[PDB]
Amino acid sequence: ARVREYSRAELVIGTLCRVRVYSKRPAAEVHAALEEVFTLLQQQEMVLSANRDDSALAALNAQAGSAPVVVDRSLYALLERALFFAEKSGGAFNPALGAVVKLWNIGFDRAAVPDPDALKEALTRCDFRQVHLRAGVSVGAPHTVQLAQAGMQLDLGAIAKGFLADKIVQLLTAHALDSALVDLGGNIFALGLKYGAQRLEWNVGIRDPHGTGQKPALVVSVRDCSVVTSGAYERFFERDGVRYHHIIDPVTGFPAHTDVDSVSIFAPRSTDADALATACFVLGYEKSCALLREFPGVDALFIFPDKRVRASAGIVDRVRVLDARFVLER
Ligand SMILES: Cc1cc2nc3c(=O)[nH]c(=O)nc-3n(C[C@H](O)[C@H](O)[C@H](O)COP(=O)(O)OP(=O)(O)OC[C@H]3O[C@@H](n4cnc5c(N)ncnc54)[C@H](O)[C@@H]3O)c2cc1C
Ligand SMILES: [Mg+2]
Ligand SMILES: [Mg+2]
C-alpha cells in the first residue's frame, strides 16, 4: 500500500475551504470522505449562517423575546461552548452581538460608520446571559434555546469555523483517516503528522498582519492542534482616513482598539482556539495572558505592531521566523 496525497477545496461558508489528506487507504475511500466533508460544510452553512435569511440560526433570531425553540444537539453544544467562552472572557467574546454587528455589516457594504444612538440602542440587546439553553434529562428530550431579551441576535461568526473544523476532524477520523490539514478560511486544524516514509509535523504559517497575505511571516510546527489567528487588518473598511475592522469590543460597540496586531491560539479543539483568538484580540496582551492562564492546555502567539513576537512555552520552540523584519522574543 502506497501513500497518496489528496486535496479538495470549495467556496462554502463564505470563504475558501480546503482539506489536504495523506493516506494509504484506497483512493475511493478518501474521495468518499472528502465528498462528505464538503457536504457537511454545505449543510452547516444552512444551520449556522448569520448572513442568510434561510438558516436555522436566522429562524432562531426571528424568535427573540418569545418562546423556546428546538435545535439539534450539535447547535445546542456549540451555543453552550460559546456562552462558556463569553462568561470566561468577561464578554470580550460575545455570541449574542448580532444587533451590533449587523449595524456595522451594512456599514461595510457602504463605507459608513453606524450612528451614535442606534449603536447605543443595539448594545442594549447583546446580553448573552439572556440566552437560555435547556435540555431535558429524559429519553429523547429535545434541546431548546430561548432568547429572553427582545431583539437580541445570535452571531456565531467568531466560533463557527472552529466548530466546523472540529466536526471535519471527527468525520475524517470516522473514515479511518489520521493525517490531514484542514483549512477553513485560514482556520487550521493539523490532524496527525504529514509525510516528508518519514513522518513530520505540519508547518502552519502565520501571516504578516499587514501583508498582502501571499506568504507567511512565521511558521509553527504542530501535530493534532488547531491554529486560529485573529487580526486587525484581515477584514475592514476605510472611511475618512480611519480603518474599521470586524472584531467589535462589546464595551464600546466599535472595532476593538488593542495592543496586538494578531493573536494565534493553539488548541486541541479548534472551537476553543477560534473563540479564544477573538476574545484575546479584544482583551489585548496582558488581559489575554491572564485569561489564557485559565486554559493550560492552550498556547498562544502574539504579533505586536512593532513586529516583536511572543509565544507561550508550549510552542515557542516550534516557531521559525521567515520574514526577518519580525523578531521572536525567547
Ligand atoms: C456558517 C457561516 C456562513 C458564512 N457565510 C458568509 C457569507 O455568505 N459571506 C461572507 O462574506 N462571509 C461569510 N462568513 C464569514 C463571517 O461573516 C465572519 O463573520 C467573518 O469572516 C469573520 O471571521 P474570522 O473567522 O476572520 O474572525 P473572528 O474573529 O473569528 O470572527 C469575527 C466575526 O464574529 C462576529 N463578532 C465580531 N466581534 C465579535 C466579538 N467580540 N465576539 C464574538 N463575535 C464577534 C462578527 O460576525 C465578526 O465578523 C460565514 C461564516 C460562517 C460561520
Ligand atoms: Mg474566532
Ligand atoms: Mg474565526
Swiss-Prot record:
<keyword id="KW-0479">Metal-binding</keyword>
<keyword id="KW-0274">FAD</keyword>
<keyword id="KW-0449">Lipoprotein</keyword>
<keyword id="KW-0460">Magnesium</keyword>
<feature type="binding site">
    <location>
        <begin position="246"/>
        <end position="248"/>
    </location>
    <ligand>
        <name>FAD</name>
    </ligand>
</feature>
<keyword id="KW-0808">Transferase</keyword>
<keyword id="KW-0285">Flavoprotein</keyword>
<dbReference type="InterPro" id="IPR003374">
    <property type="entry name" value="ApbE-like_sf"/>
</dbReference>
<feature type="binding site">
    <location>
        <begin position="92"/>
        <end position="94"/>
    </location>
    <ligand>
        <name>FAD</name>
    </ligand>
</feature>
<keyword id="KW-0472">Membrane</keyword>
<keyword id="KW-0997">Cell inner membrane</keyword>
<comment type="subunit">
    <text>Monomer.</text>
</comment>
<dbReference type="InterPro" id="IPR024932">
    <property type="entry name" value="ApbE"/>
</dbReference>
<dbReference type="GO" id="GO:0046872">
    <property type="term" value="F:metal ion binding"/>
</dbReference>
<comment type="similarity">
    <text>Belongs to the ApbE family.</text>
</comment>
<protein>
    <recommendedName>
        <fullName>FAD:protein FMN transferase</fullName>
        <ecNumber>2.7.1.180</ecNumber>
    </recommendedName>
</protein>
<feature type="binding site">
    <location>
        <position position="274"/>
    </location>
    <ligand>
        <name>Mg(2+)</name>
    </ligand>
</feature>
<comment type="function">
    <text>Flavin transferase that catalyzes the transfer of the FMN moiety of FAD and its covalent binding to the hydroxyl group of a threonine residue in a target flavoprotein. Displays FAD pyrophosphatase activity in vitro, hydrolyzing FAD into FMN and AMP.</text>
</comment>
<keyword id="KW-0564">Palmitate</keyword>
<keyword id="KW-0732">Signal</keyword>
<feature type="binding site">
    <location>
        <position position="155"/>
    </location>
    <ligand>
        <name>FAD</name>
    </ligand>
</feature>
<keyword id="KW-1003">Cell membrane</keyword>
<dbReference type="GO" id="GO:0005886">
    <property type="term" value="C:plasma membrane"/>
</dbReference>
<dbReference type="GO" id="GO:0016740">
    <property type="term" value="F:transferase activity"/>
</dbReference>
<feature type="binding site">
    <location>
        <position position="161"/>
    </location>
    <ligand>
        <name>FAD</name>
    </ligand>
</feature>
<feature type="binding site">
    <location>
        <position position="278"/>
    </location>
    <ligand>
        <name>Mg(2+)</name>
    </ligand>
</feature>
<dbReference type="Pfam" id="PF02424">
    <property type="entry name" value="ApbE"/>
</dbReference>
<feature type="binding site">
    <location>
        <position position="158"/>
    </location>
    <ligand>
        <name>Mg(2+)</name>
    </ligand>
</feature>
